[PDB]
Design a protein around this ligand. Structure first.
Ligand code: HEM
Length: 363
């Protein structure tokens, strides 16, 4: 089908021309063969994009390589940004994800409370109630865009719930403040930090909900295993977060000359940590291109990163999705995917815009 044509085109073409950051590979879902080939023949790979903002950059495609970059913030700087294209000046709000340790470590401490375990324990029964209602309102035996009707709805609910937003003069004035800045974003320390949490927990949680549904459509063996024993939901949530890799990569910038995969990454070079490709390294992961809930070491995966920038919201994400999926199995014995998805046109955000689903029956 498509996956074969791309395998042909990828192994055929001259390896230096492989530009993994092409967003048209990620939307057509044809990017796996390119990454597989690099993983073998050119693990640390110099490529060039047609786009200026990007230009030439290193693709780090293997698990251990990626870790060596992620964990080493002395050499590999999260400044000035963490996406490939260099910063404009549309949005100058201070993101601590694109800040380096001393300054970075301080700002992070300001958000660790809001995602602390005793606060998660407060939120759980609320998230569950609220998820329960969103799901009780879905239509039965009628086709819906799962992304708009379920993933966005549930994702919006969680973020609202996290910050006790509306869903009174100061509570209301803060929401409005936040809504303002989030709109501008799409088109000042503590405010950025709060905007980062929202941005960093929106499309990632969204896409993992849409992801799960497709994964189970593609593996009816593993749907059965899940509905038979619901104790496997946290496993399934892990394996989806690997399988789907909502943030495909994160970039860094070398502060000195550095040797990785026997190649000299030069000072000031851009380095793309391809988590999407590292999550499928045969060398570290058994049966990497298999949706496998009961795979051993289900938790060992790159999708939340490693090192000082490791997703601060990882346990909230896993608790959100756990509750969501408890509540989904309770209500719907089938989530039949009736048409092919329509994927986001980005090599950063690996996600869905459309996912046609029918829910036949309830309870
Ligand atoms: C499935 C869900 C999620 C995935 C896959 C994900 C993935 C990531 C990744 C890959 C990073 C960068 C790691 C690195 O550079 O080494 C990151 C950072 C971050 N994520 Fe998430 N994330 C998820 C959910 C969330 C949630 C729910 C929140 C907040 C409620 C959140 C907030 C953040 C923040 C604030 C950062 C920056 C951390 C720092 O700079 O120290 N994420 N996330």
């Amino acid at each position: 089908d498509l996956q074969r044509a791309a395998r042909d085109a990828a192994y055929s073409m001259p390896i230096e021309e492989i530009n993994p950051a092409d967003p048209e590979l990620f939307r057509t879902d044809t990017m796996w063969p390119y990454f597989e080939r690099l993983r073998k023949e050119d693990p640390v790979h110099w490529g060039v994009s047609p786009h200026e903002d990007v230009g030439g950059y290193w693709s780090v495609t293997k698990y251990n390589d990626i870790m060596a970059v992620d964990t080493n913030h002395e050499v590999f700087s999260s400044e000035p940004t963490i996406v490939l294209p260099d910063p404009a000046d549309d949005f100058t709000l201070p993101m601590f994800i694109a800040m380096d340790p001393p300054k970075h470590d301080v700002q992070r401490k300001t958000v660790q409370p809001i995602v602390a375990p005793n606060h998660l324990a407060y939120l759980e029964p609320i998230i569950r109630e609220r998820a329960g209602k969103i799901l009780d309102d879905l239509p039965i035996g009628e086709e819906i865009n799962w992304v708009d009707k379920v993933s966005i709805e549930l994702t919006t609910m969680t973020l609202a719930t996290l910050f006790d937003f509306p869903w009174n003069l100061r509570r209301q004035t803060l929401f409005e403040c936040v809504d303002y800045f989030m709109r501008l974003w799409n088109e000042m320390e503590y405010l950025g930090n709060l905007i980062l949490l929202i941005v960093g927990g929106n499309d990632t949680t969204r896409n993992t909900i849409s992801g799960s549904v497709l994964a189970l459509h593609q593996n009816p063996d593993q749907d059965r295993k899940l509905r038979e024993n619901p104790g496997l939901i946290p496993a399934m949530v892990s394996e989806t977060i690997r399988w789907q890799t909502p943030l495909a990569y994160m970039r860094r910038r070398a502060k000195r000359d550095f040797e990785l995969g026997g190649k000299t990454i030069r000072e000031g070079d851009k380095v793309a940590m391809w988590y999407v490709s590292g999550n499928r390294d045969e060398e570290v992961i058994d049966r990497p291109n298999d949706y496998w809930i009961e795979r051993p070491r289900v938790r060992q995966h790159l999708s939340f990163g490693f090192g000082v920038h490791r997703c601060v919201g990882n346990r909230l994400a896993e608790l959100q999705l756990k509750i969501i999926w408890e509540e989904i199995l309770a209500r719907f014995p089938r989530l039949e995917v009736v048409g092919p998805p329509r994927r986001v046109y980005s090599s950063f955000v690996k996600g869905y815009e459309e996912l046609p689903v029918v829910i036949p029956t309830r309870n």
